[PDB]
Amino acid sequence: SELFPAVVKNVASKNIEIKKLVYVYLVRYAEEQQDLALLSISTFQRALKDPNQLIRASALRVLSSIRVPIIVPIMMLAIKEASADLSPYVRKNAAHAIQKLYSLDPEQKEMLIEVIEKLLKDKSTLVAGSVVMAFEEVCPDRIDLIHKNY
Amino acid sequence: SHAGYQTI
Amino acid sequence: MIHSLFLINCSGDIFLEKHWKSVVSQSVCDYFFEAQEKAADVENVPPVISTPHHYLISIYRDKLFFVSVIQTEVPPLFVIEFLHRVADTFQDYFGECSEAAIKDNVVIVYELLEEMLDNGFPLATESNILKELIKPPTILRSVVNSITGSSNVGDTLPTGQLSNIPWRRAGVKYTNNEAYFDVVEEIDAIIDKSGSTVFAEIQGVIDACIKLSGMPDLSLSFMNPRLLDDVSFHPCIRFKRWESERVLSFIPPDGNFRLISYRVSSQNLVAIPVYVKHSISFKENSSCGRFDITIGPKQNMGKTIEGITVTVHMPKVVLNMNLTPTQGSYTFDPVTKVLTWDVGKITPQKLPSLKGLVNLQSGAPKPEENPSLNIQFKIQQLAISGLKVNRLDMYGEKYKPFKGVKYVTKAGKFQVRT
Amino acid sequence: GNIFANLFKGLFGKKEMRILMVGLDAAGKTTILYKLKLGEIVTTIPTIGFNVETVEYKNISFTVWDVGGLDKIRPLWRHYFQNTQGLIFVVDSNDRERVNEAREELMRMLAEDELRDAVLLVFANKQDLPNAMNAAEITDKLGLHSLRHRNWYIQATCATSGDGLYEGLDWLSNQLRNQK
Amino acid sequence: GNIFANLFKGLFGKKEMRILMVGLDAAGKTTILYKLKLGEIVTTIPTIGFNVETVEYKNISFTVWDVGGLDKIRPLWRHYFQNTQGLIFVVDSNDRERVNEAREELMRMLAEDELRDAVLLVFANKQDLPNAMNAAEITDKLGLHSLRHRNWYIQATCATSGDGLYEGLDWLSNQLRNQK
Ligand SMILES: Nc1nc2c(ncn2[C@@H]2O[C@H](COP(=O)(O)OP(=O)(O)OP(=O)(O)O)[C@@H](O)[C@H]2O)c(=O)[nH]1
Ligand SMILES: Nc1nc2c(ncn2[C@@H]2O[C@H](COP(=O)(O)OP(=O)(O)OP(=O)(O)O)[C@@H](O)[C@H]2O)c(=O)[nH]1
Ligand SMILES: [Mg+2]
Ligand SMILES: [Mg+2]
């Protein structure tokens, strides 16, 4: 934990394996150094717009993962934007990010229910399972929602 | 490597 | 679901620490240590252990304990299979899962665990997709990376992930177009003191090593399908066609792969290959006794039995044991009272056997029974189930790959009462 | 023979696959080109002439020309038609008002004898818009299924997120870099 | 001695001259960095963390960090102060309302012992604005003439036209790449 400021500076390096390793470090130690961990959020924001969708998925994973209570609004915006990414892999990672957000902020439950209701209508075979997982995790009692999708 | 295998 | 994973040796030391949701105190492993202490062996560890504020679900395999942590309600089968799969993938990328194999390659295994499990949820589970997201640690790849700055981490999502066949990467080519199939059968059996058949069965499984290029559609069919029942099927097969046409038409993925598994119906008698003559004496409070075992082939279908090993867990009364083997190797560890004899091969000219005297404990009463007899054996070019393939057609490609099949029968859980 | 220059080029990717990008005003063509070349969003004014950038992807050196869609230069596309291999045609996902003109001009461009040998790829940009048309309805209005003897395909895309741009490049790579 | 690696680097320019860019919100720092790296104008949202790009100019590999000016991250600049050589400080040409806060924060940054050895260059971005202040009045409000023992200079600039950006790089090159 003493080495957080030195590592965080490289969070935008163009060397990809260095990217993955620094992502690991931030995921590990974010919850201690709240103020220091704020620094990577802009790089994540930019990565969310990259034409490569796999990079988008990685950025979504990390941006969800950071448990700094300040970044609640930008994360909320991030899931809402990823909601219709038209890239199904990003969609599955979005479902996981929804579960992440609910784990971090209980008070967003109504919005999370709305976005999950949006997700269930997806015809993509590789997102349905994760979306159902999200439903079980966040709102187990919403038997109303799935009725059309049975 | 192909040795030991019955033809099919 | 899964919060974090602790990789702990049978020693009692904690080697690989991982976390996915929140930092779980390492103190939680103390409960595992205590539960291990109460049990009589490492093998006796529960798979579900309850602590005041965490649940531990464990796997035991290859002298390494994999304890995970859970805080919500999750189906036990889910966790147990995910852990067994991380073990399997460790085997695939490093030959095997050992504390040496882990500690020697810390960075790659941490990257792997990060890729596979996301917030305790399954992200990447199929072998081939994981092969392309992160490369195997090939030494030539390592020197190439050092030379050119190339990376072990990919940058493009493999097309198979978004394909209608998520189990195999697309666009794979090999100059040596070939494919191998392996049908391995195990003889589960219990044999009484009288040599009668207590309960026996055949457990059969098809393995397939595929080195085809392109997008082949392989077809596997059998001469005697009626012998197949309760057959298992990987996602790669089209269940509807098997139900209708009784044909294994499928698209195999790359690399090593277990194709289908099956059992043989109890309607047909299981052909037991090996019989035994056996005799041990235990005089009460005597310092010595006699041991006599003779391994014999009963139904070999005209095929040789090889790779034979006999292990016996002697009771506490035994101190030492004076025997001479007719072949193979005689080994006895007095600390664990384990009687291990390497038999090897059986020659019809002379049946291998093991006989001699047992150095017992003086003043120790005779044990109430003789420990049962377990025996390992392998038969090559023979499937006791009598299953046979019919044909191997291919569609979608133009080449004619090398085609071959094997039939190897390896002993199942074969135990002989005495 | 001493062809080592071509082998050296093929060791890294010699495919060029010249592409001409055409469309109507405000379709997003220029933003597509510049995000492919750079990645971000760049403040831009209407383009009245043409641009060029070279992008490398999957060992293919794609070169895309951004000829403007303004009517004041519209007939000028004829001069760029020769020697092209790919024809990018962007359709605004919510230009129901000018969709018929788009289809008419697209059919006219397909009518060029020089462009007879090209492959047509329709990018449905502005996918983010709520009142945006889906792929199916865009195809229905364009009648790209009515086309014959022309390899074709359509792909939904959102430029501000870059959604599917790599995918369109992948499609061209499969077809532009086909068996020959 | 075998120092051929350094000679090879100097045959093309090894100077690095790390630069930290700091300023207040909406000063235009981020646009400056990205136009230097690319050349165009890129649509951008407020930056809440930090960015990095490497730009080469006159055989000098300048590296500029864009740490955000938002108050929610303002004190965090301390962590980047070490090992820097250049301090870019952008001033909005018409931020007469927040100019005093800008000067206070600039003086505070000059008060860092780590930054004692740096060279300060004040970019007066937004030069295009009509109601924009000239260089002289900006200096008068900033009191950069009151500074002592600190090499300094100010340069008017307009990012949307890129006016003087090369010139600021030239000034840094003269001073950052000084006699030693
Ligand atoms: N909402 C939305 N706007 C977009 C999208 N793509 C481009 N735009 C906007 O559409 C407008 C026109 O984009 P341009 O790229 O200049 O259009 P063009 O096809 O180059 O126009 P011409 O130069 O006249 O041929 C700009 O304001 C873009 O930011 C998109 O996917 N969604
Ligand atoms: N008129 C005018 N606007 C400019 C100029 N330079 C930048 N801007 C605009 O000023 C606004 C803010 O620019 P940014 O580059 O995002 O400002 P910043 O300093 O990076 O802000 P933070 O990220 O919050 O630190 C944007 O709308 C820019 O287009 C300029 O020279 N003239
Ligand atoms: Mg344009
Ligand atoms: Mg900024």
UniProtKB/Swiss-Prot annotation, chain A:
Adaptor protein complex 3 (AP-3) is a heterotetramer composed of two large adaptins (delta-type subunit AP3D1 and beta-type subunit AP3B1 or AP3B2), a medium adaptin (mu-type subunit AP3M1 or AP3M2) and a small adaptin (sigma-type subunit APS1 or AP3S2). AP-3 associates with the BLOC-1 complex. Interacts with KIF3A; interaction is direct; interaction is impaired by pyrophosphorylation of AP3B1. It is found in: Cytoplasmic vesicle, Clathrin-coated vesicle membrane; Golgi apparatus. Phosphorylated on serine residues. Pyrophosphorylation by 5-diphosphoinositol pentakisphosphate (5-IP7) impairs interaction with KIF3A. Serine pyrophosphorylation is achieved by Mg(2+)-dependent, but enzyme independent transfer of a beta-phosphate from a inositol pyrophosphate to a pre-phosphorylated serine residue. Belongs to the adaptor complexes large subunit family. It comes from the Eukaryota. This is AP-3 complex subunit beta-1. Ubiquitously expressed.
UniProtKB/Swiss-Prot annotation, chain B:
It comes from the Eukaryota. Coiled coil: none annotated. Residues 2-8 are cytoplasmic. It is found in: Lysosome membrane; Endosome membrane; Late endosome membrane; Cell membrane. O- and N-glycosylated; some of the 18 N-linked glycans are polylactosaminoglycans. Lysosomal membrane glycoprotein which plays an important role in lysosome biogenesis, lysosomal pH regulation, autophagy and cholesterol homeostasis. Acts as an important regulator of lysosomal lumen pH regulation by acting as a direct inhibitor of the proton channel TMEM175, facilitating lysosomal acidification for optimal hydrolase activity. Also plays an important role in NK-cells cytotoxicity. Mechanistically, participates in cytotoxic granule movement to the cell surface and perforin trafficking to the lytic granule. Interacts with ABCB9; this interaction strongly stabilizes ABCB9 and protects ABCB9 against lysosomal degradation. Interacts with FURIN. Interacts with TMEM175; inhibiting the proton channel activity of TMEM175. (Microbial infection) Interacts with Lassa virus protein glycoprotein. Belongs to the LAMP family. This is Lysosome-associated membrane glycoprotein 1. It comes from Homo sapiens (Human). The lineage of its organism: Eukaryota, Metazoa, Chordata, Craniata, Vertebrata. The chain holds residues 410 to 417 of 417 of the full protein.
From Swiss-Prot, chain C:
It is a peripheral membrane protein. Keywords: Cytoplasmic vesicle, Golgi apparatus, Host-virus interaction, Membrane, Protein transport, Transport. Pfam families: Adap_comp_sub, Clat_adaptor_s. InterPro entries: Adaptor_comp_med_subunit, AP2_Mu_C_sf, AP_mu_sigma_su, Clathrin_mu, Clathrin_mu_CS, Longin-like_dom_sf, MHD. GO terms for molecular function: small GTPase binding. CDD domains: AP-3_Mu3A_Cterm (cd09260), AP3_Mu_N (cd14837). Residues 176-417 form the MHD domain. It is found in: Golgi apparatus; Cytoplasmic vesicle membrane. One of its GO terms (cellular component) is clathrin adaptor complex. The keyword Protein transport applies. One of its GO terms (biological process) is vesicle-mediated transport. Adaptor protein complex 3 (AP-3) is a heterotetramer composed of two large adaptins (delta-type subunit AP3D1 and beta-type subunit AP3B1 or AP3B2), a medium adaptin (mu-type subunit AP3M1 or AP3M2) and a small adaptin (sigma-type subunit APS1 or AP3S2). Interacts with AGAP1. AP-3 associates with the BLOC-1 complex. Part of the AP-3 complex, an adaptor-related complex which is not clathrin-associated. The complex is associated with the Golgi region as well as more peripheral structures. It facilitates the budding of vesicles from the Golgi membrane and may be directly involved in trafficking to lysosomes. In concert with the BLOC-1 complex, AP-3 is required to target cargos into vesicles assembled at cell bodies for delivery into neurites and nerve terminals. This is AP-3 complex subunit mu-1.
Curated annotation (Swiss-Prot), chains D, E:
It is a lipid-anchor. Its main location: Golgi. It catalyses: GTP + H2O = GDP + phosphate + H(+). GO terms for cellular component: cell leading edge; cytoplasm; cytosol; extracellular exosome; focal adhesion; Golgi membrane; neuron projection; plasma membrane. (Microbial infection) Demyristoylated by S.flexneri cysteine protease IpaJ which cleaves the peptide bond between N-myristoylated Gly-1 and Asn-2. Gene3D superfamilies: P-loop containing nucleotide triphosphate hydrolases. The keyword Membrane applies. One of its GO terms (molecular function) is GTPase activity. One of its GO terms (biological process) is mitotic cleavage furrow ingression. NCBIfam families: small_GTP. This is ADP-ribosylation factor 1. It comes from Homo sapiens. The gene is ARF1.
